[PDB]
Amino acid sequence: ASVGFKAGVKDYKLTYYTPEYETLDTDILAAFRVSPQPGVPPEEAGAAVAAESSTGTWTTVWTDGLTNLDRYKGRCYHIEPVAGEENQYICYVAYPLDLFEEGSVTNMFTSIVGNVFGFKALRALRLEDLRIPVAYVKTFQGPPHGIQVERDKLNKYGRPLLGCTIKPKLGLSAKNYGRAVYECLRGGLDFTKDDENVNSQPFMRWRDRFLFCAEALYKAQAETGEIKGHYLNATAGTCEDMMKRAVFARELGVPIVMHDYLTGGFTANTTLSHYCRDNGLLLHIHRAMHAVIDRQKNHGMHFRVLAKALRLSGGDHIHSGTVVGKLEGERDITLGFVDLLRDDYTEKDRSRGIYFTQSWVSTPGVLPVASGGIHVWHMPALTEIFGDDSVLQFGGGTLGHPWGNAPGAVANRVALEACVQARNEGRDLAREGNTIIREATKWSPELAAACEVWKEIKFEFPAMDTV
Amino acid sequence: ASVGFKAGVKDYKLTYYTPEYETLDTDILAAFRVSPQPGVPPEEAGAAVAAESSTGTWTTVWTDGLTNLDRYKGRCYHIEPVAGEENQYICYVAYPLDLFEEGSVTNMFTSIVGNVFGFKALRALRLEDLRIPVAYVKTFQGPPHGIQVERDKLNKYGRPLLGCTIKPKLGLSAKNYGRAVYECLRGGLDFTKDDENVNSQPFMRWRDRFLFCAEALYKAQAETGEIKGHYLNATAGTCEDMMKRAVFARELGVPIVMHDYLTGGFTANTTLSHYCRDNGLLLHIHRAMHAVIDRQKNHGMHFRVLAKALRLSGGDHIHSGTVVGKLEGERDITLGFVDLLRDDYTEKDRSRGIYFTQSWVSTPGVLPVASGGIHVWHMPALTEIFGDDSVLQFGGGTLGHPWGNAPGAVANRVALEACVQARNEGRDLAREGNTIIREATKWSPELAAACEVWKEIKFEFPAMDTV
Amino acid sequence: ASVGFKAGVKDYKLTYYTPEYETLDTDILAAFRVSPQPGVPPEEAGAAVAAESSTGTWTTVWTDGLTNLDRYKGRCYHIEPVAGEENQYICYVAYPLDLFEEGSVTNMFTSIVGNVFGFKALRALRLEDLRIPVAYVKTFQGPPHGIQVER
Amino acid sequence: DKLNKYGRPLLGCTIKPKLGLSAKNYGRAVYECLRGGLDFTKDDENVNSQPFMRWRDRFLFCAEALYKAQAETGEIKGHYLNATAGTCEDMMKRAVFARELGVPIVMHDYLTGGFTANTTLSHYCRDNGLLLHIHRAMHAVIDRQKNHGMHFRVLAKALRLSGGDHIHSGTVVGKLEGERDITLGFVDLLRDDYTEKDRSRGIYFTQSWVSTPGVLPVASGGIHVWHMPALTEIFGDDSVLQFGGGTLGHPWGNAPGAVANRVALEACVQARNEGRDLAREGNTIIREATKWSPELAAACEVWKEIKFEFPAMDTV
Amino acid sequence: MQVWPILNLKKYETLSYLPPLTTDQLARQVDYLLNNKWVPCLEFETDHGFVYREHHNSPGYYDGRYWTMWKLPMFGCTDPAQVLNELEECKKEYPNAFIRIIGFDSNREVQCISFIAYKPAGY
Amino acid sequence: MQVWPILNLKKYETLSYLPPLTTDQLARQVDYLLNNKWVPCLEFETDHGFVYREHHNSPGYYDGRYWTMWKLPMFGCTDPAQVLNELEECKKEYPNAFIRIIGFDSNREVQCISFIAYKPAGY
């Protein structure tokens, strides 16, 4: 059935606002927080977003008649006002499965988030959530290994894993990096790591660092009898350079490498994820740059969307915030996306900002990593918030210990184990946290010295990203 | 010279606020628009930004004594209040050359923009500009070809180049795509192109599209006698897939491919840029997703920074906005970054948002591309704003013509040439624009038909991103 | 929740005949034309087919307790007699998506049709149809071109 | 010669449940089976690479487990790693990693994977010193009925040409169909250099092999300790006897389940070598062994009354 | 400032940096495992109490991760005394072995508990 | 439920899981070999009684498979006493060696018999 072609511009709502539409189980659904310019009706704004991110443009084109636009168009099917907000709405848009390239997070974002945020007709736009249908989820590899496999390879069970970022961030030589690494690992930490911006620089070239860090990690492992790892950074300027670094890590026989997925990019990250699966390397992921995009409530993309994208592209760990540390992260929102990263199924829950029910059809879970301004006194809270399946990282919290790295590592390991034991015995980490730490200081000089130093350090400021 | 190690936290301003510092010509300079939380002094906020993006952390670490922190630390050297803004400041930070990996935009952003935007102590943060020293610029390849070489390969001189995005965005088959392409090209357009989200999908696989588009472009070129191109999209889910697509374009002997640098990523983009230089392919770059980051004045990264990053990583064209079209772009800010993309030297000019003088040491210029909601009546304004060195793209503006693609192409080519001739004769495009178009409609039926349809279409809304 | 391990053989129908099961949209469904040997009840024959082509064997193994067999087992969820045929039934079996390797027809047939056709307890067996869920279909490339592209 | 195993049938075990176990649990089961006396353990035929257990993780954990069992017992061990895959490329990647691990044997499902892929793998195994165990999954779809299809003996000849070091041949006494005379007929066609026409065993033509190596027949499927005398008598030393449920179904676990099977086998080999009639004295030989082997006694109690007897569809 | 020792300081993963568990502390850990409905199991090792690399050096490969199973996992066990009883029995049979208690979560198929319950002389 | 031992449980291939062979049981095995017309031969080893991998780790490669030949295979031997006699003689010369009896089938060129006939002290 076809009607003639009439040149000219028509309102987007005539074709793209579809309130009677019932979503299919194969549709990708998007929840957009839309703030229209004065005089632009919410139905037109939502329709414009749906049109521009799928099949339409600003004027009528005759070529629409060569296909069946009804099966390809994006559709704004529901709109709801945002409480306690001026002229802001949550618009739900449905995208047919056929619009997306299989296994490509790059393609998915290009459509949904490519051009709509710049429309003159909108003051602001934020993507809050995406319902990824199981049929699309199956086209991705997902994490190279995932929680279960990682614990099995490393033989670590019953407690959060412990890591430490070497400091200062930049400026140390390859040999000094390895020296710091051995001292941290021998004191009880499971992992040490290159900082996110440590790639290859004049003060320390990557191959020299990989070599010295391997020597240091093997020495700490032999000394303690526990498996150790040091995340070697594969982030690089080109796909080729990234691969060369991953390849040398493979040659050294180490267990884990890392990548900055947003600054390196999805295309490069997916290549690395596949390489890690093929070569048995664990992949730690940094979310460097995420706050440029996800901090403000009125504009950008919420972190939960970036977290889902990483679980599809692939990563064994991903930084998820600390809640109590130096960087922003509200408790409920955080618990919301931590479930989205670890579980196989998460039901819609607006109180935690989860707009859609999401199933993963057995795609492996990703280990959340809490890092950034945390110390021994935060241990009970961290253990309580994240539970066993998490990695807790202490950079300044280890290298800032008055007696050095090994004692700094001991303090963190003892504090963690004291909390795990207390929790397992039935104690309330939330009510008894400080008491549990104090009790441990009676027999651990290393912990006592750490507690004295950071006793009054807290990070409390109003959050910008709230439900 | 060394002082003892005292564990504990100290204010960042003690080490990172350095108002007496004279910047070196090798330093990367950053201008941050900082909005501190109540009670956080601007000097401390600026110092925190400088520390966290370079060498420091939240507490004192003994390892600082193993290096010379004075030569590696980032430094907030100047702070100025923002006029007509509450508790907002422009903080200038200097980063030594040694902190960066040569030829890696990925590494540069990881440091400068990696973690600072999420500090609990800040309400908002925006990176406005970066002064890239010539010593760092020389470590990059830059555009595979650049303006001069591109005009020389295509034999096109004396006027803006003309392109057209095929519509609907998604939903057309490979054969229908080629049919639309031939009709557009034969009417006078220099280029046609895959839309940014057209990669490889169920309705049209990439190899079929490349093949039919090559057939269509060769037919239009033989018919008209003018060199033609169709940007084939190489954007893909992995580095490997991206390379396979670029390789087939090379085999077909076509002149140009395209990539979405932000959704594909810098690592993948740099790999493609190098491949294009090695194989003589022009590289058109889409900035899909940029508005998620650069729209709001209070938080994010200004587009001028993303434009500089692309000129380093590499691209022969980059979308730059239209000013008068459907997507946001203020005239002065736009002219500012267009100069940063094309010229060898641009002097500081705060009225256009240019915070630092920037030299390029002969790195090729990039052709700005105006695309998005423009039509024949905008021609005089576009020609006046961009001048000859630009590409003007009309998607709906060609395929929305009442008589079809070839006549739609003729209308755009005639309108452009009428403007070029008028300008060359000394006429004021700004004052006489409408008259010049009307005169041309007297002898061009194709232009007259287009003018009737879009006569009253304008896009005027208040801009969010202003100087 | 776990019960002890009791060594020994039990009827397949105790674990694999599941008439109250509602199929999921992600399950691969199979319609088998089953002809049991005399004395083998259709429920046991259908259950044997479901067990042997998914997770079970002929005697109880303790390792079942290391996983959650409920999420992995094949299930005979429906049986219907064949009209005008002696002692022949159509048994419907459901297989969870997780049992199959993505993009591998070889793996799909190995499970569903690998060993069940030789059971001494059956006289004959024919696979009539398979419902391939869209989630599994998406893991395959399918035709290199297809009708439209070829024309 | 490579494995240094002589004078008795080889013993294997298929890990169960068929699907659903993680990579680490697979290796744990493997070590326990191997340390009790079995020569081999193996991936089930449909264990390729799935959401619950990806192939590379399995290969890695199984290698760790097999090396531990070998060091503990002093006897060479193997775990057949499944190379069956969706494409030739995937199949090759799996065979290549097995080579890297230095393990001795891989497996392939020749009918579901296909002859073209099987021949490629067979050549790769010859070039890299890997033993190749072959599963006949899907054969019964083709060879069960007497009126239509292709008899298994034709599929067995095809495998000996394409290539495989072992091939499943049926058990006769187990849960899957296989008549004694027909089976002995194709077992000769798989092992010998020359087999004369013999219509009583369904051998229509005399077949010579001009020294093409023989293939080891593998009896697997519903067999247990009480079937040992019969299996030894039917197949003789050159065979592999596999006990999946027959090992993992033992009341005391895998290692004791393995011991029960190894002891039962050796008791039969010793009795046969001494001149005893396995056919007449089978039950007595097993009972005698239970007097000194608690592991065997416990297995015998459990499976005492389990037999699989139904009329066969494929008869001469 | 104390220097963290270097000699004879081998560790045993979870709970090994705390003072040795008393009888009651051990029983509490077993209770925790049973209350969460995890399946208890004992493993022992006499020859290689620590991880090493003899057969391969590729990423993620280590020898010594697998120990030997004491009997079978205790499916259906609801009494901590049964576990502690098996521990004593394992100790009497293998006084020279390291013995650990693990607890399986069968839905996720991951060990949610794992700790050393007995160490031979001089460890 | 008995737990299969872990220590000092090295095995020796065929017949090694049965109670040790008595003199008569050993003689019966030798008779079996001769009745089948296989050629008997003795092999002994003092240094590496078990397989290991020192020189290579590729598929199918193991060190320790080859032992040393006692004299020569007994071509034409028809009396079990001759074999048992050589066994005693080998034992007197190498009381510290593992000694096995093998039987060759020369038409197929495969060893059809192979079993340990003597083990040194503490094995």
Ligand SMILES: O=C(O)[C@@](O)(COP(=O)(O)O)[C@@H](O)[C@H](O)COP(=O)(O)O
């Ligand atoms: O540079 C830093 O700040 C850190 O190295 C932590 O150092 P400290 O351990 O010394 O605090 C990063 O791991 C951030 O935590 C990343 O942030 P997020 O985890 O929120 O992505």
Ligand SMILES: O=C(O)[C@@](O)(COP(=O)(O)O)[C@@H](O)[C@H](O)COP(=O)(O)O
């Ligand atoms: O999807 C679109 O809107 C376009 O295809 C234009 O279509 P029309 O020509 O039909 O308007 C893109 O080129 C945008 O212009 C990109 O925005 P920017 O150039 O600002 O990056």
Ligand SMILES: O=C(O)[C@@](O)(COP(=O)(O)O)[C@@H](O)[C@H](O)COP(=O)(O)O
């Ligand atoms: O899935 C199964 O049934 C088995 O794993 C045996 O398990 P159990 O050892 O537990 O019986 C296969 O080896 C079949 O024996 C193949 O049949 P065939 O050998 O006739 O090709």
